[PDB]
């Protein structure tokens, strides 16, 4: 019966492939050919925040577009003030091997995690005038790659044990487990309506999940190597990925296939992070060749280059109002562009 | 600037003073990476070693230096996504078991991966060959033909040790890398000094390379 069930997989595989071709009558580049080009985008460095003594691995903006949080291998968690270049808090960490961080939408909590296989929650606005550990979440069997907040009592995490999970902070227990990947999960993006999210893993595939029901809806496979970054379109009906094959791709949900590919013949290094603009016209990506590129999301043309770092660029971010872009690197510095 | 603004900048300056003080203390430390297979001697490599899953960290003080050892064996995942964290380490310690005839060809394969990694082009390796008392009490019963079918030579213990060590040294293809070998037993209690000598010779070579002689 194993052979019959193995063959039934191939029968259902060709049906999905044939259905996608039946709904593909034109390409995005063909439709968008009669559009004026964006032009040349030039951005200058306005702020240079310094104080970290090792590599920076992650950062996250606040909702007010004023405050930041960054994580480094020196066991520190610093909250910055963009406008005046000031330090507000400095949080020591029990473990120095941290790989991700996040900022709560309400501005009351932050989180971090890494090779200790634990996600930690911190309380910022409290009496006694100091930051204190509020909760430690345990249960994963691999390192944490990413985490994002839904509200003050819910969080979603991805791990290197090929699983995703949804936690309740007060009870400290999982409520749903997301399974189906065959490789380590590296990235995670959350929809604006907080009802769906997507993930990218080392098996060169992306999956779309439903939070309420905990089941997989669609799967996307176009890359030739592992995926390092992922992000939604501002509308909520498309997303973009970045892989180690030196390529970014755009996927659509309703048509359920790929639309555009962003590649150049003189780029060999991989991609660390991706981000969009407020109108969804510019796509920003970070690379291992010390540079950050700006792409045209519709014409698939290169529009600008940001070059100010002496080491690998590892994290990106765009504010809610779309007024500035902040980049972090392995040279223990981060800059704000406008 | 307002009165409350001048009070904010003073708080920032005191924070920057604390960070600078913490960096100086952490700079005068020696960091080492501990690697090997299961049940090989990683956990009991130094008798005076204290502990202070994910990653296990142990530390000890010898002479006037502080040593930090990191063991990462509980990470049963892909190594290529987190191996670059330990890029600025001083050296690598690799432990192998001579008695286990089945752990070999897995220790050798793992040795080849780390020794030819992109992030460890110029990182020295200290090699430990454990359980020499059991190896000399097993070679008579098992003439090394199980682990190495293509082996011709005397069945003496000394010749077997020289053959195993040469197999591990054959995986090095680099001109700025050296391997220090040492054979130890379970009852031996002289291993902090062996690491002290190996680290001392590494810094001397590093300083010579900066001058340009070597």
């Amino acid at each position: 019966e194993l052979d019959q069930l193995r063959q039934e997989a191939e029968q259902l595989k060709n049906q999905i492939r044939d259905a996608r071709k039946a709904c593909a009558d034109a390409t995005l580049s063909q439709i968008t050919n009669n559009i004026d080009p964006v032009g040349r985008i030039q951005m200058r460095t306005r702020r240079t925040l310094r104080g970290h003594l090792a590599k920076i691995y992650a950062m996250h903006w606040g909702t007010d577009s004023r405050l930041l949080v960054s994580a480094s291998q020196d066991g520190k968690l610093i909250i910055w003030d963009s406008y005046t270049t000031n330090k507000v808090h400095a949080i020591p960490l029990r473990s120095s091997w941290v790989m991700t961080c996040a900022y709560a939408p309400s501005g009351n909590y932050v989180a971090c995690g890494g090779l200790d296989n634990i996600c930690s929650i911190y309380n910022l606005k409290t009496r006694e005038g100091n930051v204190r550990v509020s909760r430690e979440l345990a249960g994963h069997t691999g390192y944490l790659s990413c985490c994002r907040f839904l509200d003050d009592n819910q969080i979603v995490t991805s791990s290197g044990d090929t699983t995703c999970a949804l936690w309740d902070i007060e009870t400290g227990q999982q409520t749903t487990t997301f399974t189906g990947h065959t490789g380590d999960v590296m990235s995670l993006s959350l929809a604006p309506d907080t009802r769906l999210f997507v993930s990218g893993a080392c098996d060169a595939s992306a999956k779309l999940w439903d939070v309420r029901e905990g089941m997989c809806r669609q799967t996307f496979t176009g890359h030739e190597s592992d995926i390092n970054a992922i992000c939604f379109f501002p509308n909520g009906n498309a997303f973009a990925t970045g892989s180690d094959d030196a390529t970014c791709r755009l996927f659509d949900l309703r048509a359920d296939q790929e639309l555009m590919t962003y590649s150049h013949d003189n780029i060999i290094c991989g991609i660390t992070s991706v981000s969009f603009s407020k109108s969804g016209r510019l796509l920003l990506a970070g690379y291992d060749d010390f540079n950050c590129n700006v792409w045209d999301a519709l014409k698939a043309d290169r529009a600008g280059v940001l070059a100010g770092h002496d080491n690998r660029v590892s994290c990106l971010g765009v504010t809610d109002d779309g007024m500035a872009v902040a980049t972090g690197s392995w040279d223990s510095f981060l800059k704000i562009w406008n | 600037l307002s009165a409350e603004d001048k009070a904010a900048v003073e708080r920032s300056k005191m924070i920057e003073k604390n960070l600078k003080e913490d960096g100086i203390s952490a700079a005068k430390d020696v960091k080492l990476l501990l690697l090997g297979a299961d049940n090989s001697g990683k956990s009991t490599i130094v008798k005076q070693m204290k502990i202070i899953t994910g990653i296990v960290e142990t530390h000890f003080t010898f002479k006037n230096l502080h040593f930090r050892l990191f063991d990462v064996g509980g990470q049963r995942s892909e190594r290529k996504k987190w191996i670059h964290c330990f890029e600025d380490v001083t050296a690598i310690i690799f432990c192998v078991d001579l008695s286990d005839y089945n752990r070999m060809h897995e220790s050798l394969m793992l040795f080849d991966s780390i020794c030819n990694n992109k992030f460890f082009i110029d990182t020295s390796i200290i090699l430990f060959l454990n359980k020499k008392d059991l190896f000399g009490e097993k070679i008579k019963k098992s003439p090394l033909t199980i682990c190495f079918p293509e082996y011709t030579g005397p069945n003496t213990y000394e010749d077997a040790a020289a053959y195993i060590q040469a197999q591990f040294e054959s995986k090095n293809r680099s001109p700025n890398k050296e391997i220090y070998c040492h054979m130890t037993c379970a009852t031996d209690t002289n291993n902090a000094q062996v690491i002290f000598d190996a680290v001392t010779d590494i810094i001397i070579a590093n300083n010579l390379r900066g001058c340009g002689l070597y």
Partner: single-chain antibody
Amino acid sequence: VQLVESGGGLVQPGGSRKLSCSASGFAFSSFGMHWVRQAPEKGLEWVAYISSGSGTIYYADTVKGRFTISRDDPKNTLFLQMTSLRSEDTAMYYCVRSIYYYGSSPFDFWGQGTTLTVSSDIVMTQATSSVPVPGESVSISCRSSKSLLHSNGNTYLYWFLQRPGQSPQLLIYRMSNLASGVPDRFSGSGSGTAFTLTISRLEAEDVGVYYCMQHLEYPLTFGAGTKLEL
């Protein structure tokens, strides 16, 4: 959080006295401290201030050259040394904590004080003194000689409430932000040189004296105070 002050007594004119305050419940070394005194039948008056880390010290013009302020972090204690005491120094002295960073609420905790018996500034005006008033809306006004709005977009005005027999409590900081633990029926709004505090659905535990205070520049100055009766 607790702040207990010790000292006090009766001292002849020309003498000296030392006052101390103890802290228990919060990170002491991260907070700045103030001394504020109130005459037996008058309002509030700022005296001295020492920064977190002991780098900035400020004094009022009345007590300059006679008073000295100091702190001892490991023992969590604040001191005030007084010399050449006159008859105008008879008052009740308070200890106030304040922390300064983006988004903080200074002057958020006061401590019960001690009584001592010895026997180019901004003017803040509270025209009204007493207003008789449950289940009603009341408004209190305030005025300043100099505009309290800075070029960064911040207006510095603080509202305090002091019930009889109790220390003052913070109500509104900046100009409109509501302090933690305060019911949502208190609102604060205004413009340059004109400010108003509004209470909706008045209830019990709302009778007392309301004070203005500006934090634009040193020395800090208060208002006369408006009293609610019945």
